[PDB]
């Protein structure tokens, strides 16, 4: 019966003519560099007569042993966060360069690349050293994959350099960015003694009778707008393949100090749970007589026999078992509060708790919490302490114990986007992109970001206008092209940020609009490597 | 720097250049994300949204994403959304032109096509904000906050991006979406005012797509696979697909039919959707009634219930079954009781018994003086995913010679209606496989037979999905660039048909799951030709 | 409507908006399963594939019926049980072998295939250590697992398929001893299990009925592996004439041990999971609540009563122990040398008890046992991967295993054949320097694992190996780029030298034997003139 279901020319899908390729030989080449210092710059010169092509740059980084006292840990993906800039240049000048946060953005979907850059509990959990000669973190090496457009189709897209001298340059962020630390930590010494120790590897190709043809290249150019200004403009846009827009926070009006940090565990729930844990130290107190050692502005109340404390309309159920007879259960009813006028709405972190149950330990003399019912969110965990106690706040603001406040952590991670530590909250309410002075694209919802995430299979997308839907390398990229006489040589982005009540500390986080334009360049090989901005 | 060992190993042959490419110039186009509001009709009385795409400068399109605004939910009761709510709103999608339907899919088959796309799934609505069962306490309590979800209508026009795009230059395309009843996409208890909710709820859709404006487009015809689904009669282990002339694939699976029930269940895990999560939720709900600490016999259980005091050694023997219960810090005036027949089923008056209490072996915990409740520490049990998937109706069916549901009234109050339209198998995780043998017949000849789900193994293996189906794939030829390889269900030897026969596993007449009715679903992908002569038109290959 | 600015912004050109749908070869695929012949020393299954209507095949999937396991004791299956059953696979024709792979290399090839791994057996039903209580109690239910025998014939689906038109193909599978795939305690009757156990396999594949097939030759990579002698940091691969890649890794050798370990996490295979199972097993003896000094421990044990202070000092190391709700007639004791190792008396000591910082918990009056709340410790993956044998080694001047007899009874034999490194997660990297010589000249040397970094990076796998990849050319459509021999200059061999990093002679892990593994992928030419044959390229 099958013989029934089975004249004309047909393409063979059961055999292929195995073509003989170019004769080449690859080699993983590692090379130490020159480190020079203001900011730290590593330079790697690649000049070898027998290296014909290269791609897949990996910068390795040896992190020191960290000994002393205080709490200290590394930002996630520390390797990528070390990099402020990378430039690939020849004797004819720059071939390609990228900003560190955009390199991170391009590799943010490479899970293996991310893990190699430094993502472990050994690196990213906040360790604590107890003696001035105690070891906080052990020495370690991380690997940063410098993704470049020369890796896209491997040998085909490789950087050709036969009889050219190419120099890879890495500018490093201040070590302050890649470190999360306590006050007790001697950052002053650390900053002083720490140096970047880098080494650049690449896959080099020795090619016999190489046939060089020109190619095309995309270079992301980044523009940051002014603080709290909701627009940014990219000039000299003649051949752009895509345009991405995102917001980033500006923490310069603060001390960059936050109450809680989860460590290696970076899920939204983890960020929340760590916060709740730090708050719970002061939120529920078991003591003999009214608790001591809180600001006078604190309003710590004894829990009634019903177990319910009413903070305005908010009811909080607190039940601790095995409390000593001489002790009572107290609730800090305004652990953190913010208000801009005396007759305003008030943001009170204690009101975000509904139920706190646990058990007192006679042996260890502390409370062990069992079930916490609350409505703490990712934003609460991302509020700089400074904002709780800003001049705008008519209250004291920070009513924590000094013991709690001491454990606050400085975080200066340079790649934060949004207003929360997970980039969860979307604060762009409307988006308008103008090419010249005409509106090119507008949206009320984040449909450009939905398509971004959808089209790239990523959970970390951005509002992105992609103009190239053409397979890269085998075709000249499709671009939005400029008319210079009509004035269309600029891309202006303007947003309308989403509105919220002025009595939330997060309202006072300063915002910066980031616009990234991918310009098309042509890579030429007449008398060395050279690039040319398509116009 | 390059080792000299390499330099030596490196004349007279033609070689392909593998270090450079000749960049071809592509068709001149410009893409644009276009969104569209639509026309809403509640006559079909189902709700239907229609979107017309007619623009001279839109030459081609692909990647349809339908957005949906979910409202604020205020009131009293427990309420939540099924996971991937957006996909569960869709009962049907049709893409049609002036010459008629070009492509249409059933809502459940769109979902099946998108199950390995985790991003498409997250976008459709998957969060603890959306899918955890929230509770309102006052008639003005907010249960759910308003939200927008985006559902990716995967089409054959997305497969090869611009190449597979639907060309429509000089045609008017209409996308029509039929919506399932909102009852399907909602999980709620009895306290919730669904009657009002259902009345006030409206679907608010908006269709986006990637539009392509092409200069001097050179249009060529292509081919399209259309999934056609057939559902067999209730509890019948056969289904037949007719008019099969050019099938690229054939998929088989089962669905439960809960129409003989109220669709109410004892427990639901919420956002956490792991098999372990479904079980843990169930055990948690039972434990409220399974072990009681009271002064004197517990009260407010049916007279049918058999609550026993736990002996000093901790062991209650329920027939052949032993259950170890030890609760710490019990008051002196109180005792520890075990509900020994929380849920039980039997078909004859003194025969075998399926009794949920007997599936626990160990229960330990500590009584809390402050909260006047027991906190469990470790539960050893043998509850499975099937137990968590039994409609309550079946516990109290006429077929049951016992009372059946001997839980407290308080427990029964927390039961939840679940009407998710895309359930497969007989449990909520589609874990239990009830097909023992599968046969596909074209006429009297067998085309394929299997004892294990090796067709599903190949399915998941070849498509990198952890959620596959028993699938006979006939086309292994690269799509879009080749005409798909198809099987024909003959034409001359009578009718042109594929009939599927399965052998269901045999199950106990005293387990409730026996009475969950099952339906066999067969899905056939027919090959169609998409022609663009004088507008877009399709033709079933025959 | 396209926004107005776009419509304004818009030579030979390639069409990217329609394509010429070509008519492919006329074929018909069929999922074929095949029971085989079973042969026994080693267990061998054979499958012959000869059919008038099967022209080509690819995607071999081996089925495995696991029996019901009834009886008493603790028993479980290694993760990816299906892959761990396979000791060798060979595909051969009347002209001889076409392709063959060792079980561990097939596994390595699929280790980033999450579905293939899941299909082979990765579940709590399979990989959690269940316990049987009655001689007729069910420990494990019957189950089927599916093993994807990835071959070079799957790279490009129909294009790379093995053509067998008018040939008899034989797939042969050699099975490891079932001892390898099972994790069990002493109470389990392995003796009966092993006698009654049989491998029940079935080979499936995708077959193609092809009308007028036009066969052309192809190329194939065959992974050949060389294992070095125990603890030897060199190995050599001879007759290297056209290699596409070269990989190096380490394995432990547990022949000096009974293959018994104190703890196993079960299905939960995260490194933290391994540690928690260990710490959990230790805590049974580590903190004891009894009326008067604990009983039933070796006389060698040093159990001390915990002071009212709560701090017990074991040499420089302090251990804070506080258990709530301890009965009045009972005290809290700390076992201060649960496991200890030393090679000389009055020397350094490796003491597992000194690795705990804090132990808090609460005693249960109802169940007469302690429930631990918080453990501060520094147990690491290595501690969890030490054979019990090594604690009670002749090298040890101490007793070593001062655990209760109850504890020691619960220890589990593990004989998983694909363990890498010296710890159960391959976490510790013990190669400090790597040198590869082609002939006698140095081809590659590295001081960090940059070759592994690149391996993982280029293959999107988090389980890579130090690997020298020579072929960066797309498979199937091109002849693979190879490193080529100069047999004339002696350059027909690949020699690997490592410098293992050394460890403290007072840690038990120093005494775990290690083996160097080298895997060479040789290029062969597949021709189909008068049946299928392969030919080793000798450029
Ligand atoms: C869209 O870009 C393509 C498409 C293809 O098929 C239509 C290709 N096919 C082969 C064999 C090789 C390629 N580089 C290739 C690239």
DSSP per-residue string spanning B319-369: TTEEEEEEEES--TT-EEEEETTSBEE-SSTTS--EEGGGGEEEEEEEEET
* Residue among A173, A48, B459 nearest C148 (CA): B459
Report which DSSP code applies to C112: T
Is C296 exposed, middle or buried, given 0-12, 13-18 or 19+ CB atoms closer than 10 A?
Answer: exposed
Contact B5 C438 (CB under 8 A): yes
Chain B residue numbers touching C23 (CB-CB < 8 A): 482-483
CB-based contact B293:B372 (threshold 8 Å): no
Residues with Cβ within 8 Å of residue C308, at least 6 apart in sequence: none
Residue B163 CA: nearest ligand 1 atom is: 1
Q: DSSP code of A439? A: E
What is the C-alpha to C-alpha distance for residues A2 and C7, in angstroms, rounded to an integer?
Answer: 53
Looking only at the bridges linking them, the beta strands covering B166-167 and B60-70 are: antiparallel
Please choose, from the candidates C26, C107, C337, C13, the residue with its C-alpha nearest in 3D space to the C-alpha of residue B215.
C13
Cβ of A471 less than 6 Å from ligand 1: yes
Please give the method by which this entry was determined: X-ray
Structural contact between residues B145 and B129, judged by C-beta atoms closer than 8 angstroms: yes
CA distance B147 to chain C (A): 27
Structure tokens at B104: 């249409």
b/e A221-248 (16+ beta carbons within 10 angstroms → b): bbeebeeeebebebeebbbbbbbbbbbb
How far is residue C279's CA from residue C363's CA, in Å, rounded to a whole number? 18
* DSSP sequence for B21-84: ---BPBPEEEEEEEEEE-EEE-----EEEEEEE--TT--EEEEEEEEEEEPPEESSEEEEE-TT
Strand-pairing partners, residue B268, are none
Our CA angle for C133, C139, C141, nearest 5°, is 150
Residue A473 with chain B: CB contacts under 8 Å: 21, 23
Nearest to B473 by CA among B430, B435, B440, B437: B440
How far away, in angstroms, is B39 Cα from ligand 1 center?
41
- Give how far Cα B231 sits from Cα of B114, B255, B514, B524, Å: 21, 9, 20, 12
Of A103, A84, A80, A105, the C-alpha closest to A464 is A105
Give the number of C-alpha atoms closer than 13 A to the C-alpha of residue B405, restricted to the C-beta side: 19
Using DSSP, state whether A87 is helix, strand or coil. strand
Say how many Å lie between the CA of residue A529 and the centre of ligand 1: 28
Q: Give this entry's resolution in angstroms.
A: 3.1
Q: CA C133 to CA C71: how far, in whole Å? A: 7
By residue count, chain A amounts to: 535
- Beta-bridge mates of residue C170: C48, C92
Alpha helices (H) along C26-102? 81-84
For B345, how many CA atoms within 13 A lie in the half-sphere containing its CB? Answer: 21
Instruction: Sort out which chain B residues have CB atoms less than 8 A from A151's CB and list them.
Output: none
How far apart, in whole angstroms, are the C-alpha atoms of residue A152 and residue A101? 20
Distance of CA B148 to the CA centre of its chain: 20
Strand partners, B95: B103, B175
Neighbours of C394 (CB within 10 A): 5
Q: Quickly tell me which residue has 């009214």 as its tokens.
A: A290
Test A113 with C457 for CB contact under 8 angstroms: yes
Residues in chain B, how many? 542
- Mind telling me how many Å the CA of A1 is from chain C's nearest CA? 12
Q: What DSSP designation does C71 have?
A: S
Distance of CA A516 to the CA centre of its chain: 16
Contacts of C327 (CB under 8 A, 6+ apart): C289, C291, C363, C365
DSSP states of C404-427: -HHHHHT-EE---TT--SSSTTS-
DSSP per position, C255-303: TTS--EES---TT--SHHHHHHHHHHHHHHHHEEEESSS--SS-TT--E
Closest-CA residue in chain C for A469?
A: C16
Give a three-class secondary structure readout of A369-435: EEEEEECCCCCHHHCCHHHHCCCCCCCCCECCCHHHHHCCEEECCCCCCCCCCCCCCCCEEEEEEEE
Q: For residue A329, what are its two tokens?
A: 């259960």
- Cβ(B80)–Cβ(B67) below 8 Å: no
B19 vs A51, A207, A459: nearest CB = A207
Kindly report the protein residue whose alpha carbon is nearest to atom 16 of ligand 1: A474
Which residue has 């709405």 as its token pair?
A: A345
**Which of C10, C47, C76 has the alpha carbon at shortest distance from C172?**
C47
Residue with tokens 């709820």: B201
CA distance A535 to B25: 16
Are B171 and B100 in contact by the 8 Å Cβ rule? The answer is: no
Q: Whose alpha carbon is nearest atom 2 of ligand 1?
A: A471
- The DSSP letter of residue C474 is P
Q: Are B330 and B293 in contact (CB under 8 A)?
A: yes
Bridge partner residues of B32 (DSSP): B211
How is residue B396 annotated by DSSP?
T
- Write the CA distances from C17 to A239, A466, B30, B218, C242, integer angstroms: 21, 17, 12, 7, 42
Spatial distance between the Cα atoms of C517 and B80, rounded to a whole number of angstroms = 55
Question: Residue B13 burial by CB count (10 A; 0-12/13-18/19+): exposed, middle or buried?
Answer: exposed
What is the whole-number distance in angstroms between the Cα of residue C112 and the centre of ligand 1? 25
What is the torsion angle, in degrees rounded to the nearest 10, for the CA atoms of residue A301, residue A303, residue A305 and residue A306? 110
Evaluate: CB of B481 within 6 angstroms of ligand 1.
yes
Nearest to A345 by CA among A500, A498, A228, A497: A500
Q: Is A19 in the pocket of ligand 1 (CB under 6 A)?
A: no
Q: What is the Cα–Cα distance from C46 to C66, expressed in whole angstroms?
A: 19
From the DSSP assignment, how many helices (H) and strands (E) are in chain A?
9, 36
Mutate: best of A14, A200, A477, partner C, most C CBs <10 A: A14
| Alpha-carbon gap, residue C303 to C314, rounded angstroms | 11
Q: How many helices (H) and strands (E) does chain B have?
A: 10, 35
Q: Which residue's alpha carbon is at the smallest distance from atom 12 of ligand 1?
A: C477
* Secondary structure class of B152 (helix, strand, coil): strand
DSSP conformation letters of B397-460: -TT-SS--B---HHHHHT-EEE--TT--SSSTTS-S--EEEEEEEETTEEEEEESS-HHHHHHH
d(C-alpha C179, C-alpha A61), whole Å: 44
Nearest CA in chain C to B487: C28
Alpha-carbon separation of residue C133 from B383, C104, C136 (angstroms) = 19, 35, 8
Could you tell me how far CA C375 lies from the centroid of its own chain?
Answer: 30
Q: Which residues contact A301 (CB under 8 A, 6 or more apart)?
A: A309, A330, A331, A333
Chain B residue with minimum CA distance to A375: B129
Alpha carbons within 13 A on the beta-carbon side of B484: 25
Task: Kindly list the partner chains of chain B, i.e. chains with 3 or more CB atom pairs below 8 Å.
Answer: A, C
In eight-state DSSP terms, residue B303 is: T
């Amino acid at each position: 019966t099958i013989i029934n279901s089975l004249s004309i020319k047909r393409s063979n899908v059961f055999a292929v003519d195995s073509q003989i390729p170019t004769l080449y030989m690859p080699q993983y080449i590692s090379l130490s560099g020159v480190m020079t210092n203001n900011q730290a710059i590593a330079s790697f010169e690649i000049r070898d007569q027998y290296i014909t092509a290269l791609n897949h740059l990996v910068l390795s980084l040896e992190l020191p042993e960290v000994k002393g006292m205080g709490r200290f840990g590394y930002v996630p993906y520390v390797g990528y966060k070390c990099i402020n800039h990378v430039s690939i240049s020849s004797c004819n000048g720059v071939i390609w360069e990228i900003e560190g946060e955009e390199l991170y953005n391009n590799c943010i979907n490479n899970t293996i690349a991310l893990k190699h850059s430094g993502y472990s509990s050994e690196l990213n959990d906040i360790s604590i050293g107890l003696t001035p000669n105690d070891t906080i973190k052990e020495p370690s090496t991380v690997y940063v994959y410098i993704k470049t457009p020369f890796d896209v189709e491997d040998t085909f897209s490789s950087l050709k350099l036969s009889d050219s001298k190419i120099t890879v340059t890495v500018t490093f962020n201040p070590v302050s960015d890649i470190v999360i630390r306590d006050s007790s930590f001697d950052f002053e010494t650390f900053n002083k003694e720490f140096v970047y120790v880098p080494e650049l590897s690449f896959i080099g190709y020795m090619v016999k009778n190489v046939q060089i043809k020109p190619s095309f290249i995309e270079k992301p150019r980044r523009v940051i707008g002014q603080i709290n200004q909701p627009t940014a403009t990219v000039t000299e846009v003649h051949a752009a393949t895509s345009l991405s827009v995102y917001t980033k926070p500006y923490y310069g009006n603060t001390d960059n100090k936050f109450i809680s940090y989860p460590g290696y565990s970076q899920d939204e729930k983890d960020y929340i749970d760590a916060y709740v844990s730090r708050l719970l130290d002061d939120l529920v107190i078991v003591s003999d007589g009214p608790p001591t050692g809180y600001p006078e502005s604190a309003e710590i109340v004894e829990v009634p026999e019903d177990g319910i404390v009413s903070i305005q309309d908010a009811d909080v159920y607190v039940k601790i078992d095995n409390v000593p007879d001489n002790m009572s259960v107290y609730l800090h009813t305004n652990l953190l509060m913010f208000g801009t006028r005396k007759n305003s709405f008030i943001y009170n972190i204690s009101k975000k708790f509904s139920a706190i149950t646990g058990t007192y330990s006679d042996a260890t003399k502390r409370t062990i919490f069992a079930h916490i019912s609350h409505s703490i969110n990712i934003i609460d965990t991302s509020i700089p302490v400074s904002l709780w106690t800003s001049q705008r706040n008519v209250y004291n603001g920070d009513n924590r114990s000094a013991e709690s406040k001491a454990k606050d952590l400085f975080i200066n991670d340079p790649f934060i986007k949004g207003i929360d530590f997970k980039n969860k909250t979307d604060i762009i309410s409307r988006l308008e992109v103008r090419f010249g002075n005409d509106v090119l694209y507008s949206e009320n919802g984040p449909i450009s970001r939905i398509y971004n995430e959808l089209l790239t299979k990523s959970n970390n997308g951005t509002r992105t206008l992609t103009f190239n839907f053409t397979p890269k390398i085998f075709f000249r990229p499709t671009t939005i092209t400029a008319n210079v006489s009509r004035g269309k040589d600029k891309l202006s982005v303007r947003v309308v940020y989403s509105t919220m009540d002025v009595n939330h500390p997060i309202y006072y986080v300063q915002k910066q609009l980031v616009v990234v334009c991918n310009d098309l360049y042509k890579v030429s090989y007449d008398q060395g490597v050279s690039i040319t901005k398509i116009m």
